Amino acid sequence: MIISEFDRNNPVLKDQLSDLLRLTWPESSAEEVEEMMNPERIAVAAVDQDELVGFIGAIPQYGITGWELHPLVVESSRRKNQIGTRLVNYLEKEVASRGGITIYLGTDDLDHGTTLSQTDLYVHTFDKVASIQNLREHPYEFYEKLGYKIVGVLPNANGWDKPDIWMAKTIIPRPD
Amino acid sequence: MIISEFDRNNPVLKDQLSDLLRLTWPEEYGDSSAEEVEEMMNPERIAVAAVDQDELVGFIGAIPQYGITGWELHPLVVESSRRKNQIGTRLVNYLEKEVASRGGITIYLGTDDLDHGTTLSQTDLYVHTFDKVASIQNLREHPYEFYEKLGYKIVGVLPNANGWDKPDIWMAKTIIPRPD
């Protein structure tokens, strides 16, 4: 398996990304893939032989300092979590290379995956954020293991008690 | 002065909006004004105008980011007059009503602290993040408190968003009653 910057001129590789996004989330695909091919963004591919098994992207939202991690998609396979970890690490390195400081992301709790759903998050917001528990292997803990910290929540974002969890990580050393 | 829905077929209103976005924020919309005005008039979005004597004095917009339930408040632009905060309060209230009418549940926004406007800047926000958020103080009339007076609560911050110790403050408010 090789991790490299996504070659945006391999059309079948792009269509592989578009099938991957088609199959992981039924909620089509070519339009969003073309948004992910913006030269403004960072696009990283994880390729085994000529098969695309992983893709990760980042959007510069705050100049060059703040980047949003979107999306991360890995074919359901063996070592899925390892490919995802490697892609995250490579993306952090790319963002640092361009003068980036922090990567942040939103991961939704749509079906009671965490203890932040099914509760009124405006009451003791940060006490509930600090005491979060993973109820159904929600991906938030995946990023928590890679150094990302929950720094915010959007109450009722996707419907009542279906919030978005905001996680961030500063990927370069603090100046001293 | 009247707050009403922005007429997306008014080129005169559009050019007034592009003049306001140019003059209030020369940094952002000096070259982006026609482009971003056309981006702000997307029919999926909400566009609300504040007009006094056929002059566009205020504008507020909202983007549906989470289906139709979660909306981001962007942008809010008021001409620098003595009634700036009244116009803004007025626009926020009208926008909340608009978003609720369209099936929206929560409106959220980001307000950046670039130069020590609050106590959340000029510090490592990764050290005692939520205690520093809870003990926040407005040092130089930062807009976060303007939104706090309108019912918005700080629900998150992004440390080092705009550079080291120049964070973004995330605020949210749910605009419809809790169903029982």
Q: What is the DSSP string of B51-69?
A: EETTEEEEEEEEEEEETTT
Chain B residues with CB inside 8 Å of A149's CB? 126, 129
Region class of B12: left (phi > 0), else alpha (psi between -120 and 50), else beta: alpha
Chain B residues with CB inside 8 Å of A119's CB? none
Q: Are A168 and B155 inside 8 Å of each other by CB?
A: no
Q: Are A66 and B106 inside 8 Å of each other by CB?
A: no
Residues B74, B61 contacting (CB under 8 angstroms): yes
> Residue B40: which H helix or E strand, with range?
helix B33-40
Residues A8, A45 contacting (CB under 8 angstroms): no
Rounded Cα distance between B158 and A66, Å, is 9
Rounded Cα distance between B122 and A80, Å, is 40
Residues A21, A35 contacting (CB under 8 angstroms): no
Tell me, in Å, the resolution of the deposited structure: 2.5
Cα–Cα distance list, B121 to A152, B127, B135, B153 (Å): 17, 12, 13, 18
User: Is there a binding annotation on residue B141?
Assistant: yes
Rounded Cα distance between A73 and A78, Å, is 14
**β A102-108/A66-74 pair status:** parallel
Q: Which long-range contacts (CB under 8 A, 24 or more apart) does B59-63 make?
A: B59/B6, B59/B17, B59/B20, B59/B21, B59/B91, B60/B88, B60/B91, B60/B92, B60/B94, B60/B95, B61/B95, B62/B95, B62/B98, B62/B99, B62/B104, B62/B107
Cα–Cα distance list, B45 to B6, B28, B39 (Å): 11, 20, 9
Q: Can you give the residue range of the structural domain that contains A8?
A: 1-176
A37 touches chain B (CB under 8 A): no
Q: How was this structure determined?
A: X-ray
Considering only CB atoms, B162 lies closest to which of A63, A121, A159, namely A63
Rounded Cα distance between B18 and A58, Å, is 30
* Contacts (Cβ under 8 Å, ≥6 apart) of A61: A67, A68
A60 touches chain B (CB under 8 A): no
Buried b (16+ CB within 10 A) or exposed e, A9-18: eeeebbebbb
Rounded Cα distance between B180 and B175, Å, is 15
Of the candidates B64, B142, B166, the residue with the CA atom closest to the CA atom of residue B108: B64
Rounded Cα distance between B49 and B20, Å, is 12
Residues B95, B73 contacting (CB under 8 angstroms): yes
Q: Are B105 and A156 inside 8 Å of each other by CB?
A: yes
Residue given tokens 């307000």 in the structure block: B111
Q: What is the DSSP string of chain A?
A: -EEEE--TT-HHHHHHHHHHHHHH----HHHHHHHHT-TTSEEEEEEETTEEEEEEEEEEEETTTEEEEEEEEE-S-TTHHHHHHHHHHHHHHHHHHTT--EEEEEEE--SS-BTTSSS-TTSSHHHHHHT--BSS--THHHHHHTT-EEEEEETTTTSTT-PEEEEEEE-SPPP-
* DSSP-assigned beta bridge partners for residue B55: B52
* Contacts (Cβ under 8 Å, ≥6 apart) of A30: A15, A18
Q: What is the DSSP string of B73-115?
A: EEEEEE-SSTTHHHHHHHHHHHHHHHHHHTT--EEEEEEE--S
Q: How many domains does chain B have?
A: 1
* B-chain residue closest to A129, CA distance: B130
Q: Are A152 and B170 inside 8 Å of each other by CB?
A: yes
Q: Are B162 and A66 inside 8 Å of each other by CB?
A: yes
Of the candidates B70, B74, B102, B45, the residue with the CA atom closest to the CA atom of residue B174: B70
Rounded Cα distance between A84 and A73, Å, is 8
Q: Are A102 and B168 inside 8 Å of each other by CB?
A: no
Buried b (16+ CB within 10 A) or exposed e, B93-109: ebbbebbbeeebbbbbb
Residues A43, A5 contacting (CB under 8 angstroms): yes
Task: Quote the minimal CA–CA distance from B9 to chain A in Å.
Answer: 28
Rounded Cα distance between B129 and B156, Å, is 9
Residue B140 in 3-state DSSP?
coil
B172 touches chain A (CB under 8 A): yes
Q: Are A63 and B133 inside 8 Å of each other by CB?
A: no
Q: How many residues does chain B have?
A: 180
* DSSP-assigned beta bridge partners for residue A103: A67, A169
**β B153-158/B106-112 pair status:** unpaired
A101 touches chain B (CB under 8 A): yes
Cα–Cα distance list, A75 to A15, A48, A106, A124 (Å): 14, 11, 20, 38
